[PDB]
Structures are given as C-alpha cells and as structure tokens.
Ligand binder design. Structure first.
Ligand SMILES: Cc1nc(C)c(C(=O)Nc2ccc(Oc3ccc(Cl)cc3)nc2)o1
Length: 112
C-alpha cells in the first residue's frame, strides 16, 4: 500500500466528517479563554483542525489511529458537557453520522 493514495483518502474522509459538524463546534480546539477549566477534565483535547495538522505530520499511517482521534472529539464532548446540553447531543449526532462516514472510508482503504 502506497502512502499518497491513503493520505488522499484520509483528507477526503476528514472533509466528510467536518461536513457532519454543521454547527462547526468541533472544527477548532475548545477555546480555553472561554472554557478555562477544560484541561482539568480533558487530558487529550482534539478537534478537526488539529486532526488536519496531525494528518499532514504523518501521524495517521493507518485507519485506526485516524479514527482514534475522531473518537476523542466525541468522547471529550460527552465527558465534559452535561447530558441536557446542545454540545452533548451534537457529539451523539457526530458519533452516529461520523461512524457511517468512517465505515465506508475504511472499506475503501481495505481495497488498497
Ligand atoms: C465541543 C465543545 N465542548 C465545549 C465545552 C465547547 C465549547 O465550549 N465551545 C465553544 C466555546 C466558545 C466559543 O466561542 C464563543 C462563544 C460565545 C461567546 Cl459569547 C464568545 C465566544 N465557541 C465554541 O465545544
């Protein structure tokens, strides 16, 4: 398996995941200026912009590690936010819609 087609697939998949985040609440790191206690509870923050940086820094050489950082976006949000919030429901919706995107992308990868 050659590296450039795989990275092309991951770039497309990250764009498709970002599209499911129609509110753009997962596109950038959670702003500590507004949420100063965020790092007290969340030990590995993650967001789609950071994922894009990691992608280009070759830190995703297999689908599992890509999907792991996507799962962090979801679990950080379920963890920090109360169940009755918009943020929490948005993470539940991203988990569902994002899982479908990831499953189709993984089959594409498995064909390479
Ligand atoms: C996935 C997730 N978990 C959390 C806890 C958050 C989160 O707090 N997001 C967030 C916070 C602030 C902000 O900008 C402003 C919003 C309102 C005003 Cl008045 C000024 C700036 N934009 C996004 O996102």
């Amino acid at each position: 398996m050659q590296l450039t087609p795989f990275l092309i697939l991951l770039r497309k998949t990250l764009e498709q995941l970002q599209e499911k985040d129609t509110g753009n609440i997962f596109s950038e790191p959670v702003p500590l200026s507004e949420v100063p206690d965020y790092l007290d509870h969340i030990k590995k923050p993650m967001d789609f912009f950071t994922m894009k940086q990691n992608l280009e820094a070759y830190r995703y050489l297999n689908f599992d590690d890509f999907e792991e950082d996507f799962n962090l976006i979801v679990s950080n949000c379920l963890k920090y936010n109360a169940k009755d919030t918009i943020f929490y429901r948005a993470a539940v919706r991203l988990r569902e819609q994002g899982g479908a995107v990831l499953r189709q992308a993984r089959r594409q990868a498995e064909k390479m």
